Amino acid sequence: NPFDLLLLPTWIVPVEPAGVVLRDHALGIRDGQIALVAPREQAMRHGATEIRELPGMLLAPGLVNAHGHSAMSLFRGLADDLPLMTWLQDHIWPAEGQWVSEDFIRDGTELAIAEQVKGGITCFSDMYFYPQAICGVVHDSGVRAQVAIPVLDFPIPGARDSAEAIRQGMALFDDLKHHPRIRIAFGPHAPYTVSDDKLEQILVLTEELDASIQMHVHETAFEVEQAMERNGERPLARLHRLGLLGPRFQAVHMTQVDNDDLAMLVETNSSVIHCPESNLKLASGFCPVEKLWQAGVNVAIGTDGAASNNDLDLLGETRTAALLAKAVYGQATALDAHRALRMATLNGARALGLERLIGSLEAGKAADLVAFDLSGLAQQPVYDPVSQLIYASGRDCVRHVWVGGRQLLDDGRLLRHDEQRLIARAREWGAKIAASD
């Protein structure tokens, strides 16, 4: 009974146990799962149909991009450096009104997946329009995904109202019930865009389905202050009041965190999705990551959409996060390199409810893997491969990617996408969108 594939990289970082880096080790894959992580000597005895040596490379769990709006890849750099509401009202919202259709979503989503896989990301979360179309693209691509159904108080592309959005959502939930790679979640945009009734409605359906909820929460001081002078109650407190908080709740951003907020996070075991670069670019503020971490809150990381980043580089986000957390907390020891990688992998898994399947290199879990090349000039000398990954390596060093043991990236080449076709298609869109803007 040989492995299907045995990988022999210079270094393996399993993430669990924390801090550990393995040398002269092997990872064996069988039937899509990690069957063994062990010394090379030991593993070579089981036999393997295929054996790949990966000298100079670091093998890790695939990255988990825990929050995105993928098809906004087509809006990448459309209008930068404007006031937030000018950006939205003069540029993003009209462009969405004119251009967002199933064709837009299909092209923009595939564009985004292609970029993410190239950057070593094996699992992502999407919160955008035409979810059914999104799922189709995710299915073909082979990556893992949470697709969150957008629910709002007003018409959006694809849904004339919240009722239709939930109906389409429910139909989606059923159709993908046994999909091995995709899970449906609910994704109400933010507390300030969704009614209490809609929130309670979402909760019932969610507990009915054991499904997750992802929402932008406390992204700005303005949202929080305004909820005060209006309702006399912090948005998170309101969500807590209505019973939406919990281990399946994903609070995105959370730049505004007081002690009541914190206690509510620790109590409900809710996840926070950290999006540092978007927070900086939009002047939203500084998520207190080390503080949340020390309290025991699960903190994952996402890129947000490519129009406020403007790349979908999770390795890059993670470095930004690891650097920023030190200055925000006031200590150089905050969010260290191993914890940063954990945030980008196992914590993402936990946020998305997938921590039994992915996020660490342990026997029994899915073979969602990324191999990073550390043999480049600018990475020398390599004293600690994980330090060098986090603080000195770019996403271009990603060489190979597997999801469920199926290879999606081979020496930097995408096996499930035609890169030049997507480029050409993205250009056709950009030409049209540029003209309308």
55-114 binders of its own copies (CB under 8 A): 74, 76-84, 87, 111, 114
Q: How far is the CB of 7 from its own copies (least distance, A)?
A: 23
Which does residue 87 bind out of Zn ion, Mg ion, its own copies, none, counting CB within 5 to 8 angstroms by kind? its own copies
Mind giving me the DSSP string for 46-96?
T-EEEEEEEEEEEEEEPEEE----GGGGGGTTSS-SS-HHHIIIIIIHHHH
Restricted to residues 210-249, the positions that interact with its own copies (CB under 8 A) are none
Angle at 96 between CA 94 and CA 101, to 5 degrees: 140
Per CB under 5 A, 309 contacts Mg ion: yes
Angle at 99 between CA 97 and CA 105, to 5 degrees: 110
Could you tell me which stretch among 95-103, 159-167, 217-225, 270-278 binds Mg ion (CB under 5 A)? 270-278
Which uninterrupted H or E stretch holds 171?
helix 162-175
Find the binder of its own copies among 59, 63, 133, 382 (CB under 8 A).
Answer: 382
Q: Which is nearer to its own copies, 142 or 405 (CB)?
A: 142
- Pair of tokens at residue 260: 């009541």
In the list Mg ion, Zn ion, its own copies, none, the entry touching 51 (Cβ below 5 to 8 angstroms by class) is: none
Cβ atoms of 32 and 366 within 8 Å: the answer is yes
Nearer Cβ to its own copies, position 26 or 121?
A: 121
Per CB under 5 A, the list member of 304, 336, 368, 373 interacting with Zn ion is 304
Instruction: Give the nearer residue to its own copies in terms of CB position, either 29 or 111.
Output: 111
Cβ at position 109, least distance to Zn ion in Å: 15
Least distance from its own copies to the Cβ atom of residue 380, Å:
4
* Amino acid at the residue 50: E
Candidates 185-193, 194-202, 346-354, 375-383; binding stretch for its own copies (CB under 8 A): 375-383
Site for its own copies contains 392 (CB under 8 A): yes
- Residue 292 beta carbon to its own copies: minimum distance, rounded to whole angstroms: 17
Is the distance from CB of 17 to CB of 362 less than 8 angstroms? no
> Alpha-carbon distance 363 to 126, whole Å?
28
**Contact between 64 and 124 (Cβ < 8 Å):** yes
State yes or no: residue 311 binds Mg ion (CB under 5 A).
yes
Only segment of 42-50, 96-104, 265-273, 305-313 that touches its own copies (CB under 8 A): 305-313
Q: List 25's β-bridge partners, or say none.
A: 39
Residue 270 interaction partner, one of its own copies, Mg ion, Zn ion, none, beta carbon < 5-8 Å per kind: none
Q: Applying CB under 5 A, which of residues 110, 277, 336, 373 lies at the interface with Mg ion?
A: 277
The contacts of residue 211 (CB under 8 Å, 6+ apart) are 173, 183, 184, 185, 186, 205, 248
Measured at the CA of 180, the angle between CA 48 and CA 34, to 5 degrees, comes to 30
Task: Tell the residue number behind the tokens 């907020």, with chain if given.
Answer: 261
Is 148:138 a contact under the CB 8 Å cutoff?
no
Site string for Zn ion, 194-233 (x = CB under 5 A): ----------------------------------------
304 contact, one of Zn ion, Mg ion, its own copies, none, CB 5-8 Å limit per kind: Zn ion
Instruction: Give the list of residues 6+ apart from residue 190 with CB closer than 8 angstroms, or none.
Output: 215, 216, 217, 219, 223, 235
**Closest residue by beta carbon to Zn ion:** 304
Task: Enumerate binding residues for Mg ion (CB under 5 A).
Answer: 277, 309, 311, 313, 316
- Report the interface residues with Zn ion, using CB under 5 A: 304
